[PDB]
Design a protein around this motif. Structure first.
Motif, mmCIF file in Angstrom:
data_model
loop_
_atom_site.group_PDB
_atom_site.id
_atom_site.type_symbol
_atom_site.label_atom_id
_atom_site.label_comp_id
_atom_site.label_asym_id
_atom_site.label_seq_id
_atom_site.Cartn_x
_atom_site.Cartn_y
_atom_site.Cartn_z
ATOM 1 N N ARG C 20 0.826 -1.212 0.000
ATOM 2 C CA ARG C 20 0.000 0.000 0.000
ATOM 3 C C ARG C 20 0.862 1.265 0.000
ATOM 4 N NH1 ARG C 20 -1.283 4.332 2.473
ATOM 5 N NH2 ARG C 20 -3.394 5.202 2.210
ATOM 6 N N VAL C 21 1.807 1.327 0.936
ATOM 7 C CA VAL C 21 2.730 2.456 1.072
ATOM 8 C C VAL C 21 3.599 2.611 -0.186
ATOM 9 C CG1 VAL C 21 3.863 3.703 2.954
ATOM 10 C CG2 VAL C 21 3.027 1.358 3.364
ATOM 11 N N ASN C 22 4.292 1.536 -0.573
ATOM 12 C CA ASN C 22 4.964 1.455 -1.879
ATOM 13 C C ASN C 22 4.988 0.025 -2.434
ATOM 14 O OD1 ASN C 22 7.267 1.488 -4.009
ATOM 15 N ND2 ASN C 22 6.983 3.666 -3.551
ATOM 16 N N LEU C 23 4.631 -0.102 -3.709
ATOM 17 C CA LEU C 23 4.450 -1.392 -4.380
ATOM 18 C C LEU C 23 5.696 -1.839 -5.154
ATOM 19 C CD1 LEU C 23 2.486 -3.695 -5.730
ATOM 20 C CD2 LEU C 23 1.923 -1.900 -7.374
ATOM 21 N N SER C 24 6.305 -0.899 -5.880
ATOM 22 C CA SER C 24 7.471 -1.166 -6.724
ATOM 23 C C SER C 24 8.634 -1.696 -5.896
ATOM 24 C CB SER C 24 7.898 0.107 -7.457
ATOM 25 O OG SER C 24 8.447 1.050 -6.549
ATOM 26 N N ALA C 25 8.898 -1.027 -4.778
ATOM 27 C CA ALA C 25 9.968 -1.417 -3.872
ATOM 28 C C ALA C 25 9.680 -2.795 -3.287
ATOM 29 C CB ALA C 25 10.124 -0.383 -2.776
ATOM 30 N N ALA C 26 8.452 -2.978 -2.801
ATOM 31 C CA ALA C 26 7.984 -4.266 -2.283
ATOM 32 C C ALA C 26 8.193 -5.393 -3.289
ATOM 33 C CB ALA C 26 6.519 -4.183 -1.863
ATOM 34 N N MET E 5 -2.782 -6.896 -3.199
ATOM 35 C CA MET E 5 -3.483 -7.243 -1.990
ATOM 36 C C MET E 5 -4.387 -6.089 -1.579
ATOM 37 S SD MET E 5 -1.817 -9.338 1.221
ATOM 38 C CE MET E 5 -1.488 -10.768 0.218
ATOM 39 N N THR E 6 -5.583 -6.427 -1.112
ATOM 40 C CA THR E 6 -6.483 -5.445 -0.532
ATOM 41 C C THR E 6 -6.033 -5.155 0.901
ATOM 42 O OG1 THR E 6 -8.067 -7.118 0.263
ATOM 43 C CG2 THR E 6 -8.423 -6.252 -1.961
#
Lengths: 201, 12, 197, 203, 212
Positions: C20-26, E5-6
Motif C-alpha cells: 500500500r505504502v509502496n508497491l514497486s519497492a515491495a 493485496m487489498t
C-alpha cells in the motif's frame, strides 16, 4: 556531504542492514552485493522503508520462535544421523556421545519453561558436551596421520559454539527469551554433525 | 536391459 | 524440509503488507530475496535472525524517532486567528509532546502510569477542541473533518489496545510504534482542519 | 523545494537519542532550565545540522577529565560542614547536623577505600549505618515538632530514600562492570540530597 | 504481472501467524507465486479466498492439504490415464510430405510415443518393465537416426531451430533416464509417468517444427 543528504528515517539501513550484508560477504559476495544494492535503491527512492521492513519482521517474531523451537524438537528424529561406520571401540564411543548430546539438546523445549527443572537439565548437557569432548580427543590422538588443517579446525568450532551456548543460557535467565537458546542449541547440533562428517575422512 | 539405455545416453 | 520456510512465512507477508505504502519497492525486494534464497537455501533465515539479534539498536532508534515526532514542523499549523482554532493547535502540541516522551517514562511503572492518565487527559481534551471547532465550518461541508476525527479515534483505540497488550508482553516497541502513528494521525487532524477552513 | 529543510537528517539523530532523554529527565526537577536548553539546541540544530553531534563528541573527548573531576568533587564533599548547617541550638537539630556531616564525611572517603576490596565492604556498611542514623534523626525532628512546611519535607525525605536506594543499586552494578565513576556520580547525588534536606528545614 | 493485496487481505494475513497456519505460506504461497506468471487472475482470487478462510479458521489450509495427499491414488490413476492417451496422434503431426524419409520419421515417432504410453501397464512386472526400457532405448535410438538422416539431407527451411528441439528432446530424454534410476530407489511411479509424458510432448514438438 553524504550524512546531511541522508534522512534520519534511513539510519536502520546503515545500523542494521549494512552489518548484515558485511557478514554475508565473507561467505557469499554475490548475494550480499545484490541484496545491499536493492535495499540501497529502495531506501533512496522511499526513505523509511527499511525501518518499516524491520518493524514488520520484529512484529512477526513469534513465527520465528515457533520455527526455531520446531527445528530443535524435530532434531530428535536425527540423533543417529552420521554414525561413523568404523569398527573401532573409540569410534563406537564417539557416535554414542554424539547421539546422546543431540537427544538432550532436542529435549530443551520441554524442560525450559519450568526454570527450576531447566537447571537440572543444564547439568546433564554440560556433562554431555564434556563427555563428547573427551571422546573427540580420545579418537584424535590415535587418528592423525592424515588431515590436520580441517580436523583440528572442527574441534575448535565445537568449543566456541558449546561455550557460546553456555553464554546464551546465562543471558536467558537475565533476558527470558527462549529463541536464542533454541538457535544456539540448533547450532551445536549442526556442529556435532560436522565432527561426525569430518572424522569420517 | 538397463545397460543399453545407459549406453545410449552415453553416446549423446 | 524447508530451511526456506521463513522466506514465505516472514518475508512475503512483510512485503505483502507494505505494498500500500509502496508497491514497486515491495516487488523489487521480493524478487531479490527470492533470487537469493533460490541460490542460497537458508540465507533468508540467517538474515532474519541477524535482524532480530539487533533488537536493541532497533528499539533505541524507534525511541529516537518517537522523541523526534513531537516538535512543531512547518506544514501543520492553522493560520486562522480564532481562539477555537488556536486552542486546537496547542492541544495537538500537548498530546504530541506527551506521546513523544513515552520512551523515558515506560521503564518506571509508577511514572508511566501517570503518563497514561496524562495521555488520556490530553486525547480527551484534543477531541473537545476538535468538537468545538466543528461549528466554525459550514455544516454541509464537514465530510473530511468528521472522517479524520474517526480515523484519529480509531488510532487512539488502537493505542489503548497496544497499551493493554504491553502489560501482558513487556514488548515496548509496540507502544512506541503505536504512539508515533497516533502522533502522525494528530498531524493529519491539523492538515485536514487547515485545508477545509 | 523546502522539504529538505523540514526533513530531519541522519546527522541530527544525537539530538533526539542523547539530548532529549537528558532534557526529559531534567524537566521533572528543573523545568525552566530543561525548556531553555532544549529550545537552544533545537534552534541551533535546525540552523546547522550536525552541531549537536559535534558538541557530544567534544564532551566525550573530555571523559578522563570529567572522571577525574567527579572523584575530586567527592573528595571535597568533606569541606562543606559549617556549610548548609542549620543555626539552631537544639539537641535534635545539632544531631541532624552531626548525622548529615557524618554521612558526607564517609561518602567523601569512597575514593580512598574503593580500591581496597575488604576495606570498601566495611565502608559500605559504615555508609549504610550512617544513612540509617541520619534518616532516624530526620524522622524524630518530624516526630517531635510538627513542622510548618507540608509534605515538602516528606517529598525530600522520599527523594533521599529514592536516591539512597539508587546508590545501593549502583553498588551491586559496580561489582559486575567495575566502573567506579558510577559510584562517585551516585555518591555525589546522595550528598546533594543530604544538603537539600538541611535546606528544607532551615526556612 | 503481480498479484495485488487489498487492505482487508493485508490485515488478515498479519493476524494469521500461529503455527497451524504455516502451510498457507510454506505450500500455498509458492504455488500462488508460480501461478502468478501464467495466470494472474486465478493466483490472486485463489490467494484471496485462501487468506480469508485461513484467517477465520486457522488450520484450514493444513486440513485441505492433508486431504489432497490422502487422495494420492486418485492422482496416480489420473496421471496413468494422461500418459496412456498421450500417444493418440491427432494426425496433425503426420508429415504432409509424401517422401519416404518423412514417412520413416512419422513411424519412428509413433513407435516411441506408443511404447512410452504403455508404461503404466508394464511397470508392475520387473521383467516386462526391463524389456520396455530396452524398447524405449531402441525407439529413441532409431528416432535420433531418422532426425539426423532428414536433418542434413533434406529440409533446412527458414527455421534452423530444428537443432534446438533435438537438443531439447535429448535433455528430456536424459531426464527420463534419471527418473527411472530414482524410481528404482523410491517406488514412486508417478514421477515416471510424468516424465514419460514430457518426452512424448517433446517428440510432438519435433514433428511440429517441420510444418510451422
Amino acid at each position: 556531504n553524504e550524512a546531511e543528504t541522508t534522512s534520519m528515517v534511513s539510519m536502520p539501513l546503515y545500523a542494521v542492514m549494512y552489518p548484515v550484508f558485511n557478514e554475508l560477504e565473507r561467505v557469499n559476495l554475490s548475494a550480499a552485493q545484490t541484496l545491499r544494492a536493492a535495499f540501497i535503491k529502495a531506501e533512496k527512492e522511499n526513505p523509511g522503508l527499511t525501518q518499516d521492513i524491520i518493524m514488520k519482521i520484529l512484529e512477526k517474531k513469534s513465527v520465528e520462535v515457533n520455527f526455531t523451537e520446531s527445528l530443535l524438537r524435530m532434531a530428535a528424529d536425527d540423533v543417529e544421523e552420521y554414525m561413523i561406520e568404523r569398527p573401532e571401540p573409540e569410534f563406537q564411543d564417539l557416535n554414542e556421545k554424539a547421539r546422546a548430546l543431540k537427544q538432550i539438546l532436542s529435549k530443551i523445549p520441554d524442560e525450559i519453561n519450568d526454570r527450576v527443572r531447566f537447571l537440572q537439565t543444564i547439568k546433564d548437557i554440560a556433562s554431555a558436551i564434556k563427555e563428547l569432548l573427551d571422546t573427540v580427543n580420545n579418537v584424535f590422538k590415535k587418528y592423525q596421520y592424515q588431515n590436520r588443517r580441517a580436523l583440528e579446525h572442527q574441534k575448535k568450532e565445537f568449543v566456541k559454539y558449546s561455550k557460546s551456548f553456555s553464554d546464551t543460557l546465562k543471558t536467558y535467565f537475565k533476558d527470558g527469551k527462549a529463541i536464542n537458546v533454541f538457535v544456539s542449541a540448533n547450532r551445536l547440533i549442526h556442529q556435532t554433525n560436522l565432527i561426525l562428517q569430518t572424522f569420517k575422512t | 536391459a538397463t545397460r543399453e539405455l545407459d549406453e545410449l545416453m552415453a553416446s549423446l
